[PDB]
Write a structure and sequence with these properties.
alpha+beta; 5-stranded mixed β-sheet; 40% strand; 9 strands; 2 helices; Substrate Binding Domain Of DNAk, Chain A, domain 1; 4-stranded antiparallel β-sheet
Length: 144
């Protein structure tokens, strides 16, 4: 019925950027536009995470994929359309599309987390909220 944890990707500096918030009713789909952190960046590495912590290293890695062939441009210029989709079965599909070329790549996360594991993660996020925000502040929608 609901997404037990927020689902997002890593933005520059290892920042957790959530596309689907914890407790969102499913099926659900959210889209955000991202960009490159470096000049003439030829690709973006999409790193899929689940959890409530501000930094991705403190959340659970679900999977990674690369989107290559980004045409040369200054940092912050390319437009990468990222869509997180949860179907009726609770399965997550993540797609990244380069708006200039139309090139897309995707990953489907399979469940081949218990109530206590989810509760531990939510509680830990509440306990370390300040340390987490300090780390986030020092390091917007740019991807590496």
């Amino acid at each position: 019925d609901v997404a037990p944890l927020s689902l997002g990707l890593e933005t520059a500096g290892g920042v957790m950027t959530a596309l689907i918030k914890r407790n969102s009713t499913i099926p659900t789909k959210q889209t955000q536009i991202f960009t490159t952190y470096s000049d003439n960046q030829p690709g973006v590495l999409i790193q899929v995470y689940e959890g409530e912590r501000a930094m991705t290293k403190d959340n659970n890695l679900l999977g990674r994929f690369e989107l290559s062939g980004i045409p040369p441009a200054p940092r912050g210029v390319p437009q990468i359309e990222v869509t997180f989709d949860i179907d009726a079965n609770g399965i997550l599909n993540v797609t990244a599309t380069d708006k200039s070329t139309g090139k897309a790549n995707k990953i489907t996360i399979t469940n081949d987390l218990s109530k206590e594991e989810i509760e531990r993660m939510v509680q830990e996020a509440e306990k370390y909220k300040a340390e987490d925000e300090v780390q986030r502040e020092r390091v917007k929608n740019a991807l590496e």
